[PDB]
């Protein structure tokens, strides 16, 4: 047969995510990791699959793996915050989303209003949690 390159399996998991096959996509990213475990995006992409699967702990651990490879990652800080938000770790979530925002400015990355909106939503969810 043929065995793909790590890059080729990342491409395949990307297509599987867009096809809404999230456990399959996540396994594809694991196969990419087997070939090259030093590529941050494989872990962040797999964390998005885990989030869609409502597996917050597994997504969180992949965000940590990505952050050990790229400490400047907007995407890893953003999805770390999103994992924490889903787990109701509100203050940690907001700080990581704010760090994502600052990094994106430093890097001149345009996500429209997505990060400010994500913060507003996070702070409102936190506020509602405090007011009971
Ligand atoms: C390039 C790429 O992956 N684009 C893309 C478009 C639409 C969506 N939508 C959903 O997954 C629901 C994902 C990725």
UniProtKB/Swiss-Prot annotation:
Tissue and organ expression note: Expressed in differentiated myotubes (at protein level). Highly expressed in skeletal muscle, heart, pancreas, brain and placenta. Detected in kidney, liver and lung.
Stated consequence of mutating residue 8 to K: In SCAR16; reduces protein level; does not reduce ubiquitin ligase activity and autoubiquitination
TPR repeats: 6-39, 40-73, 75-107
Induction (record text): Up-regulated by inflammatory signals in regulatory T-cells (Treg).
Processing after translation: Auto-ubiquitinated; mediated by UBE2D1 and UBE2D2 and enhanced in the presence of MAP2K5.
Residues with the Phosphoserine modification: 3, 5, 129
Localization per record: Cytoplasm; Nucleus; Mitochondrion
Result of altering residue 10 to A: Loss of interaction with FOXP3 and its ability to ubiquitinate FOXP3. Loss of interaction with SMAD3, HSPA8, HSP90AA1 and HSP90AB1. Reduces interaction, ubiquitination and proteasomal degradation of NFATC3
Record disease entry: Spinocerebellar ataxia, autosomal recessive, 16: A form of spinocerebellar ataxia, a clinically and genetically heterogeneous group of cerebellar disorders. Patients show progressive incoordination of gait and often poor coordination of hands, speech and eye movements, due to degeneration of the cerebellum with variable involvement of the brainstem and spinal cord. SCAR16 is characterized by truncal and limb ataxia resulting in gait instability. Additionally, patients may show dysarthria, nystagmus, spasticity of the lower limbs, and mild peripheral sensory neuropathy.
Free-text comment about domains: The U-box domain is required for the ubiquitin protein ligase activity.
Quaternary structure and partners: Homodimer. Interacts with BAG2. Interacts with E2 ubiquitin conjugating enzymes UBE2D1, UBE2D2 and UBE2D3. Detected in a ternary complex containing STUB1, HSPA1A and HSPBP1. Part of a complex composed of STUB1/CHIP, VCP/p97, CHRNA3, and UBXN2A that modulates the ubiquitination and endoplasmic reticulum-associated degradation (ERAD) of CHRNA3. Within the complex UBXN2A acts as a scaffold protein required for the interaction of CHRNA3 with VCP/p97, this interaction also inhibits CHRNA3 ubiquitination by STUB1/CHIP and subsequently ERAD. Interacts with MKKS. Interacts with DNAAF4.
Additional detail: Antibodies against STUB1 are found in patients with chronic lymphocytic leukemia (CLL) and in colorectal cancer patients.
Function: E3 ubiquitin-protein ligase which targets misfolded chaperone substrates towards proteasomal degradation. Plays a role in the maintenance of mitochondrial morphology and promotes mitophagic removal of dysfunctional mitochondria; thereby acts as a protector against apoptosis in response to cellular stress. Negatively regulates vascular smooth muscle contraction, via degradation of the transcriptional activator MYOCD and subsequent loss of transcription of genes involved in vascular smooth muscle contraction.
Protein's UniProt name: E3 ubiquitin-protein ligase CHIP
Organism for this UniProt entry: Homo sapiens (Human)
Upper taxonomic lineage: Eukaryota, Metazoa, Chordata, Craniata, Vertebrata
Gene name of the record: STUB1
């Amino acid at each position: 047969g043929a065995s793909p390159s790590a890059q080729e399996l990342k491409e395949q998991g990307n297509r599987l995510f867009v096809g809404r096959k999230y456990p399959e996509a996540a396994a594809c990213y694991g196969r990419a990791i087997t070939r090259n475990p030093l590529v941050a995006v494989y872990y962040t992409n797999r964390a998005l699959c885990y989030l869609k699967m409502q597996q917050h702990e597994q997504a969180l651990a992949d965000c940590r793996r990505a952050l050990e490879l790229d400490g400047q990652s907007v995407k890893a800080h953003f999805f770390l915050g999103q994992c924490q938000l889903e787990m109701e770790s509100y203050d940690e979530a907001i700080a990581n989303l704010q760090r994502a925002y600052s990094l994106a400015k430093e890097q001149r990355l345009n996500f429209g209003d997505d990060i400010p909106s994500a913060l507003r939503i996070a702070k409102k969810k936190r506020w509602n949690s405090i007011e009971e």
